[PDB]
């Protein structure tokens, strides 16, 4: 409820920094990241601390901090 | 020739009408150093299978003639053969586009016989086991052929 800066670092090299309230679920930031970048939330996945992030999860609940980076990954499957 | 028309357009009748020499005749007529050309022949012979005995035993004997000449050839790669077989039966994806054959009954029953044979490398068995057990529409289409072959394969 004070603010953190979270960076979202894409596989394409882009970085988008969000100011987000610590008690706000990340589903909000995920949606805004997809809207900004023009992707779909099922077409990619979000990871912090190498662990996959739920929509439900909260930065404090995930024990985040300022300048803590979230990594995005392009979905892919072998065939 | 007589064989070349039977291979080009397989029918169960044309198999008998080759005569009692048909096993050798077809085995002779094919390149047994080529896994794919062996696969093409195996399926053509397979396609005419009926469980009526004089067609059955005639397919089984052409298969045994074809495979024994193939499996004893040093220029013949057994693993490449099985791979191309699974490709042509539409159980395994390939880089090349292949003709989908609708009914797997004959090929299944043929395989069921041929797996029992002593010329058959026991090494190719669990590969087969893995792709027959694996979900497929045309394998579900003949469940009894599929099941019979599976139980033969567990015995190996």
């Amino acid at each position: 409820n004070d603010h953190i800066n979270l960076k979202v670092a894409g596989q394409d090299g882009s970085v988008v920094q969000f100011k987000i309230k610590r008690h706000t679920p990340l589903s909000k930031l995920m949606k805004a990241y997809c809207e900004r970048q023009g992707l779909s939330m099922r077409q990619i996945r979000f990871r912090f601390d190498g662990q996959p992030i739920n929509e439900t999860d909260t930065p404090a609940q995930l024990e985040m901090e300022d300048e803590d980076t979230i990594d995005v990954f392009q979905q892919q499957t072998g065939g | 020739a007589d064989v070349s028309t039977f291979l080009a357009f397989p029918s169960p009748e044309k198999l008998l009408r080759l005569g009692p020499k048909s096993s050798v005749l077809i085995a002779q007529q094919t390149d047994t150093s080529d896994p794919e050309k062996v696969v093409s022949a195996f399926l053509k012979v397979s396609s005419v299978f009926k469980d009526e005995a004089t067609v059955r035993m005639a397919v089984q004997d052409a298969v045994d003639a074809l495979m024994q000449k193939a499996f004893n050839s040093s220029s013949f790669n057994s693993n490449t053969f099985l791979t191309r077989l699974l490709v042509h039966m539409g159980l395994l994806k390939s880089e090349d586009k292949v003709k989908a054959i609708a009914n797997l009954y004959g090929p299944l029953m043929a395989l069921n016989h041929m797996v029992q044979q002593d010329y058959f490398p026991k090494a190719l068995a669990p590969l087969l086991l893995a792709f027959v057990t694996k979900p497929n529409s045309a394998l579900e289409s003949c469940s009894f052929a599929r099941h019979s072959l599976l139980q033969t394969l567990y015995k190996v």
Binding site: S14, V15, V16, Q17, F18, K21, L29, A32 | -
Partner: protein, 65 residues
């Protein structure tokens, strides 16, 4: 108020135009804005095996770099 974008890494008009022309990500050429960047001379004579040798068998970072 809920979430806000304060910062995005963004290229100049020129860099983005070059990326766009080649269908590359916008931030592709931003390596040229690194303080290390030498505006380098060199032609590429270096073959695959040399590049492999130049690794010295070390495939991962140890944090000591």
């Amino acid at each position: 108020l809920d979430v806000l974008i304060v910062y995005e890494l963004t290229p100049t008009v020129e860099e983005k135009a070059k990326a766009d022309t080649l269908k590359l990500p916008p931030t592709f050429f931003c390596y040229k804005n690194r303080p290390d960047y030498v505006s380098e001379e060199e032609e590429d004579d270096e073959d695959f095996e040399t590049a492999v040798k130049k690794l010295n068998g070390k495939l991962y970072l140890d944090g000591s770099e």
